[PDB]
C-alpha cells in the first residue's frame, strides 16, 4: 500500500520534467509555413469480390499488390494496376481481424477470435497454398501480427500482451508485458529495431524488440486508442482513440505535440496512416468518411468520400503514390 | 511486347477465383448466422441439444441450415470482439431465472446489448432457462425476490399468462416477473427496428431448434415488411 | 492522465449517513456517465447506481434503492453518493467507474479488476 505514494512521486516528478522541457508549441513554431493547400484525391480503382464487410489489408513492399481480409473468411491478393485476384485462401475460421504481407513477398498472416497467427506460403513448389505455421500461445483475441522478417513475426492480442515469434520453431521468444487494456494495433519503426503499441486504457508504449522492456509510455488520450502509426523518420508517431481525436506523440521530448480535432466531429478513429513526405495524416471514421489532416498546422486539407459503410482499414504505399481504403461494405478503393 | 502471356495467365487465374467465389457467395448467403451469449453456469452449453469465434455449431430444420457461435475463451472485458457480430440473424440470451444475485447482471449485460450502438438492428432471443429449479426455491419458500427486487410486492400476473396445468400462482406469477423485467428494457426504446422473443426453457427440453426456427421467421419477415413500408 | 479519486468513507453505525465524493481529471467529465460499484468481502463487483451526462436519467439497484442516491455537478468534476440508513450489508470498497465512450448509453465496466477508468475505491465498514 505503500508503493502508492512512490507511484504518485514518480507520476508527478516525469510530469515536471515534461512541463519544463515544454519549451514551445509545434503550431507557433510552423504559424508562418504557406498552408498546403486542397486536395482533392479522386477514386482510381474499386475491387470486389469480397461478401462481407473488410476488416484488415496491407500493402506490399512492390507497391502493386496486398491483400485484405473479410467476415466470410477470405483472404484475397490484389493486383491493383490490372484488377485481378492473385489468390483466395479459404481461412479455417471466419472471424479474422488482422492479415499481413511479408516483405519478401513470400508469406502472408492473419488471425481474430481462433487466437492464432497462421502463416501462409505464397511461393509453393506443389504450386497450391497452404498453411505453414500455425502460433498458440495467446490467450486473447489477435488484433495484430506484423511482420519483421521472413522468420520474424511481431503480434498483439486482445489478453494485454504482445508477443515475438519465431516461425520456424513457432515459439514465442519474447513477451511485452504491461499494458492494462487490450492491444489494438502495433507499428513497426523502419529501423526494425523498436515498436509502438496502443490499447484500451488510453495509453501506448516503445518497445525494445532485442531487449524486450518498455521503454516509454504516452497517456494524452481520454479512450481506447484503435490505430497507431510511425512517423517516416523514426521519431514520432500518431494514434486514434474512441474520443474523436487523433494527436502527434514524439520520441525524444516525450510528450503530444498537437492534437488534430473539429467540434463537428463526435465519431471515433479507426485508422491512421501517413504520406511518404510525412505532411499528410489519413484518418478513417465511422461516419464513412476519411479525412486529410496537414500534420504541421493540424488544418482539415481534403475528404475522402465514396464509402457507404464504416471505414475499417487504411494503407498508403511504399512508394508513396496511392492510398487504400477498406470498409465494411466490402469493398476496396485506391485513391490516387 | 511478346508478354501477353502474361495477361492471359492472369486473367485465367482471375475467371477461376470468381467462378469459386460464385459458389461460396451462394454457400454463405444460403445460412443463417446466430450468436450465443449468456453467463457461466446458465445452460447456454446445452440450450440445443445439437443432434441434428470459439465454439461452433450446426444444425438444420427444414432443411435450412443454421450457424451458431459462442465466444467462450476471452477475457470479461466484451466491449470489442462484441463488434464483430453487427450482421448476425439474431442475438441468443440464454439467462439462469433462478439465481436472484446474477438477475441483476443478467439484466445490465442485457441492457447493454440492447443499447450498443452497432447492435441496434438485432432481435434478440431471450431463453429463460432452468425454470424447475425456479419452481423448486419458489415452492421451498425461503428465499424472498422481493429482497432483491422490492417492486414485486405489488405485481400481479398478466391476464394473458398461459400458465402450464398444474403450475402454482406463486410459480407462474415469479416467472412473469422475471420475463416482464426483461421485457421493459427491451420496449423502453428501439424505434421498431428489433424485437424481443420470451420463452420459458428446462434443461431437460428439446423444442428449442423449433423455437428458433420460428423465431428467425418471424424476424426476417418483419424485416421485409419494414422494407416494404408495411410495418 | 485518466484519474478517479474517491474522498468519503470510514466507520459508520448501523442506521446512520455517510457521503462519498469521487473528483475526476484528465478527461471531458461532461461527456461521459458514472458509476458507482462496490466489492463486498469474498464476493466479486457489483454495479450499484449511475448517472447520465446531464443528471437526467439515474438508476439504482433494487438492494439500494430507497436509501441511496447519485448526484452530479459538471461545474467542478465531482461525482457524489449520499448513503442513508445503510445496513451491515453494505460493507465493501466503493469505487467509481466511468463509462468507456462518450455520448453514448452502454458500458461494460465490471471486469475483473481489469477496468482501466475505474478509481482505487474507498473503504466503507458498517457494524457495532
Known amino acids: 500500500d505503500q508503493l502508492r505514494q512512490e507511484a504518485e512521486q514518480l507520476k508527478n516528478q516525469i510530469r515536471d520534467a515534461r512541463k519544463a522541457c515544454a519549451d514551445a508549441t509545434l503550431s507557433q513554431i510552423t504559424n508562418n509555413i504557406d498552408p498546403v493547400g486542397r486536395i482533392q484525391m479522386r477514386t482510381r480503382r474499386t475491387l470486389r469480390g469480397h461478401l462481407a464487410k473488410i476488416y484488415a489489408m496491407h500493402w506490399g513492399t512492390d507497391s502493386r499488390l496486398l491483400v485484405s481480409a473479410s467476415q466470410d473468411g477470405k483472404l484475397i491478393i490484389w493486383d491493383s494496376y490490372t484488377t485481378n485476384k492473385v489468390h483466395a485462401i479459404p481461412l479455417r475460421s471466419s472471424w479474422v481481424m488482422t492479415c499481413a504481407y511479408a516483405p519478401s513477398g513470400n508469406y502472408v498472416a492473419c488471425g481474430g477470435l481462433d487466437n492464432i497467427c497462421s502463416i501462409y506460403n505464397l511461393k509453393t513448389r506443389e504450386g497450391n497454398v497452404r498453411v505453414s505455421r500455425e502460433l498458440a500461445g495467446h490467450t486473447g483475441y489477435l488484433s495484430c501480427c506484423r511482420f519483421l522478417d521472413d522468420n520474424q513475426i511481431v503480434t498483439s492480442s486482445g489478453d494485454t500482451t504482445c508477443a515475438l515469434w519465431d516461425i520456424e520453431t513457432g515459439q514465442q521468444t519474447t513477451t511485452f508485458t504491461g499494458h492494462t487494456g487490450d492491444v489494438m494495433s502495433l507499428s513497426l519503426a523502419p529501423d526494425t529495431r523498436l515498436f509502438v503499441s496502443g490499447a484500451c486504457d488510453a495509453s501506448a508504449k516503445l518497445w525494445d524488440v532485442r531487449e524486450g522492456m518498455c521503454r516509454q509510455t504516452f497517456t494524452g488520450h481520454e479512450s481506447d486508442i484503435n490505430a497507431i502509426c510511425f512517423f517516416p523518420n523514426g521519431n514520432a508517431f500518431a494514434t486514434g482513440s474512441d474520443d474523436a481525436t487523433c494527436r502527434l506523440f514524439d520520441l525524444r521530448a516525450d510528450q503530444e505535440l498537437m492534437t488534430y480535432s473539429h467540434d463537428n466531429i463526435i465519431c471515433g478513429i479507426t485508422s491512421v496512416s501517413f504520406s511518404k513526405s510525412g505532411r499528410l495524416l489519413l484518418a478513417g471514421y465511422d461516419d464513412f468518411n476519411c479525412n486529410v489532416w496537414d500534420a504541421l498546422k493540424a488544418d482539415r486539407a481534403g475528404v475522402l468520400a465514396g464509402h457507404d459503410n464504416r471505414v475499417s482499414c487504411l494503407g498508403v504505399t511504399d512508394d508513396g503514390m496511392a492510398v487504400a481504403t477498406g470498409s465494411w461494405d466490402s469493398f476496396l478503393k485506391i485513391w490516387n | 511486347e511478346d508478354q501477353r502471356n502474361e495477361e492471359k495467365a492472369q486473367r485465367e487465374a482471375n475467371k477461376k477465383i470468381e467462378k469459386q467465389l460464385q459458389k461460396d457467395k451462394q454457400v454463405y448467403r444460403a445460412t443463417h448466422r446466430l450468436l450465443l451469449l449468456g453467463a457461466d453456469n446458465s445452460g447456454k452449453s446445452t440450450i440445443v441439444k445439437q443432434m441434428r469465434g470459439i465454439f461452433e455449431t450446426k444444425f438444420q430444420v427444414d432443411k435450412v441450415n443454421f450457424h451458431m457461435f459462442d465466444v467462450g475463451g476471452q477475457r470479461d472485458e466484451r466491449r470489442k470482439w462484441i463488434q464483430c457480430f453487427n450482421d448476425v440473424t439474431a442475438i441468443i440470451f440464454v439467462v439462469d431465472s433462478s439465481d436472484y444475485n446474477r438477475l441483476q447482471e443478467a439484466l445490465n449485460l442485457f441492457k447493454s446489448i440492447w443499447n450498443n450502438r452497432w447492435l441496434r438492428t438485432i432481435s434478440v432471443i431471450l431463453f429463460l432457462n432452468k425454470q424447475d429449479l425456479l419452481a423448486e426455491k419458489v415452492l421451498a419458500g425461503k428465499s424472498k425476490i422481493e429482497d432483491y427486487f422490492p417492486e414485486f410486492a405489488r405485481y400481479t400476473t398478466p391476464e394473458d399468462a398461459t400458465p402450464e396445468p398444474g403450475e402454482d400462482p406463486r410459480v407462474t406469477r415469479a416467472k412473469y416477473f422475471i420475463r416482464d423485467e426483461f421485457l421493459r428494457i427491451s420496449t423502453a426504446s428501439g424505434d421498431g427496428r428489433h424485437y424481443c422473443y420470451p420463452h420459458f426453457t428446462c434443461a431437460v427440453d428439446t423444442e428449442n431448434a423449433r423455437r428458433i426456427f420460428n423465431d428467425c421467421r418471424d424476424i426476417i419477415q418483419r424485416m421485409h415488411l419494414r422494407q416494404y413500408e408495411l410495418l | 492522465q485518466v484519474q478517479l479519486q474517491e474522498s468519503g468513507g470510514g466507520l459508520v453505525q448501523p442506521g446512520g449517513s455517510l457521503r462519498l465524493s469521487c473528483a475526476a481529471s484528465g478527461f471531458t467529465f461532461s461527456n461521459y456517465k458514472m458509476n458507482w460499484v462496490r466489492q463486498a468481502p469474498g464476493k466479486g463487483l457489483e454495479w450499484v447506481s449511475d448517472?447520465?451526462?446531464?443528471?437526467?436519467?439515474?438508476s439504482y439497484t433494487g438492494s439500494v434503492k430507497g436509501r441511496f442516491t447519485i448526484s452530479r455537478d459538471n461545474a467542478k468534476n465531482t461525482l457524489y453518493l449520499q448513503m442513508n440508513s445503510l445496513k451491515p450489508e453494505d460493507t465493501a470498497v466503493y469505487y467509481c467507474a466511468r463509462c468507456p465512450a462518450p455520448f453514448t448509453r452502454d458500458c461494460f465496466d465490471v471486469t475483473s479488476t481489469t477496468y482501466a477508468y475505474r478509481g482505487q475505491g474507498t473503504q466503507v465498514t458498517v457494524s457495532s
Open positions: 448517472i447520465s451526462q446531464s443528471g437526467a436519467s439515474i
